Structure formats: structure tokens, C-alpha cells
Enzyme design. Sequence first.
Site, short mmCIF file in Angstrom:
data_model
loop_
_atom_site.label_atom_id
_atom_site.label_comp_id
_atom_site.label_asym_id
_atom_site.label_seq_id
_atom_site.Cartn_x
_atom_site.Cartn_y
_atom_site.Cartn_z
N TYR A 17 0.84 -1.26 0.00
CA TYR A 17 0.00 0.00 0.00
C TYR A 17 0.84 1.26 0.00
O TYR A 17 0.31 2.35 -0.26
CB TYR A 17 -0.89 0.02 1.26
CG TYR A 17 -1.94 -1.06 1.26
CD1 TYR A 17 -2.98 -1.05 0.32
CD2 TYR A 17 -1.86 -2.12 2.16
CE1 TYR A 17 -4.00 -2.13 0.31
CE2 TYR A 17 -2.82 -3.16 2.16
CZ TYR A 17 -3.90 -3.12 1.26
OH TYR A 17 -4.83 -4.16 1.24
N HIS A 22 -4.19 6.18 -1.47
CA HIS A 22 -4.84 6.23 -0.17
C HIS A 22 -3.77 6.49 0.94
O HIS A 22 -4.13 6.84 2.01
CB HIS A 22 -5.59 4.88 0.10
CG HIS A 22 -6.82 4.99 0.99
ND1 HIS A 22 -7.64 6.10 1.01
CD2 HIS A 22 -7.44 4.05 1.76
CE1 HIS A 22 -8.71 5.84 1.78
NE2 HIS A 22 -8.61 4.59 2.24
N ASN A 70 -9.24 2.28 7.91
CA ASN A 70 -10.59 2.35 8.45
C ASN A 70 -10.65 2.23 9.98
O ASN A 70 -11.66 2.39 10.57
CB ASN A 70 -11.51 1.35 7.79
CG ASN A 70 -11.66 1.57 6.31
OD1 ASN A 70 -11.19 2.52 5.78
ND2 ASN A 70 -12.30 0.66 5.66
N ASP A 95 -5.60 11.70 1.78
CA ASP A 95 -6.01 11.78 0.38
C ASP A 95 -7.43 12.30 0.30
O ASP A 95 -8.27 12.05 1.16
CB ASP A 95 -5.97 10.39 -0.21
CG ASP A 95 -6.83 9.36 0.61
OD1 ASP A 95 -6.64 9.24 1.89
OD2 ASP A 95 -7.65 8.66 -0.06
N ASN A 116 -12.95 7.26 4.75
CA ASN A 116 -13.15 6.17 5.80
C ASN A 116 -12.11 6.19 6.92
O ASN A 116 -12.34 5.57 8.03
CB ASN A 116 -13.20 4.81 5.06
CG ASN A 116 -14.56 4.70 4.28
OD1 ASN A 116 -15.63 5.04 4.85
ND2 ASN A 116 -14.52 4.30 3.01
#
Length: 193
Positions: A17, A22, A70, A95, A116
Site C-alpha cells: 500500500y 490512499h 478504516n 487523500d 473512511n
Amino acid sequence: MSNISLIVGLGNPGSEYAQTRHNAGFWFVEQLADKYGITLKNDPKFHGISGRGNIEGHDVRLLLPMTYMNRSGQSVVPFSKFYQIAPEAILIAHDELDMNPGVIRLKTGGGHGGHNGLRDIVPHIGPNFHRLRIGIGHPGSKERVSGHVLGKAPSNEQSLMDGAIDHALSKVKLLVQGQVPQAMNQINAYKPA
């Protein structure tokens, strides 16, 4: 105004990631940390990676939750409570789907706007912290939002975002010194060169 004393970058853990959109928040805070020689270390008590050091004459804490996006409040909330840092002294970089690459805004208050990670934080510390909204673009439709935020931007869009992040980095001195309205003017006026 309050000086900003805690700067948080939102994102997901792991090499898979690290380069995704994100993680825009992580890019800003990691680059800020190295600009000022602040070391980010594992901080399992707070489910994150954190550091502390001098930025432009002020003592500032830096935090990257390692909860996954999240669940970011499981790090931001106990950390800010433990060090007794009020929301008004917090800046959270993240973001922003609703702004294009190369657009960047500083915002104070408001809700999560569908983000989120912020959804997991506003309920517990309230909305009155500051946000650095780093534009990542919107892919076109609700169905592709997830693959867009969870994907790596092409190099053109990536330069735009990096240029925007470099600009906000140059304004952090105003933020830590309490100058939030000036910082907001000066960050929000950015347009790619």
C-alpha cells in the site's frame, strides 16, 4: 490560534500500500519527518509509528496509524488523549478524492466527507482538528473508487501530487507557529508550476 503540535498522516501499512493514493497522508508525514530529522519508530502502545522533535522551533509529534485506514481512530484517539493534545492542535493529512492531483487545501472542522479514515476519528475527538486534503482525483464512478484509492497513480499524476505535498511542506513552519489563517491562505493558493 493554537499551534499545531501533532501531525498525523493516514494510510495503510505494508509495502503493497506504500505507493497507493490512499497513502497520500503517509507520504506527507514521512517526508516531513525526514526533512526535519525526526525519527519515526514503532509505537505498538498506540498502534502506530510515531516520532517527536523540533520543527521550526516547536516540539511536534508525528503519527502514522498502523491500524489500517478504516481503523485509524484506534491509534489517533488514544495517542492524542494520552499526550493531552486537543483537536485544535492536530493536523491530519489525507487523500482527498474530491480534488484533483496537484490541488491541496487546508481545512478546519467539518465532517469526514466520506473519507473512511476520518470517519473513524471524528466520532471520538470531534471535528475541530485541521486537515491537509491532498487531491488524488476521482476515477469517474462510485464502483471504481476503491480500485482508484487502493491503486498506484501514473507518473504524471504522481508529480502533481508530489509538487502539492512539497508546497504544503514549506508551509509547516506557519502551522507549528500558530499561524493557521496565513497557512490556509498560502497552502490553498497553490497551483502547479
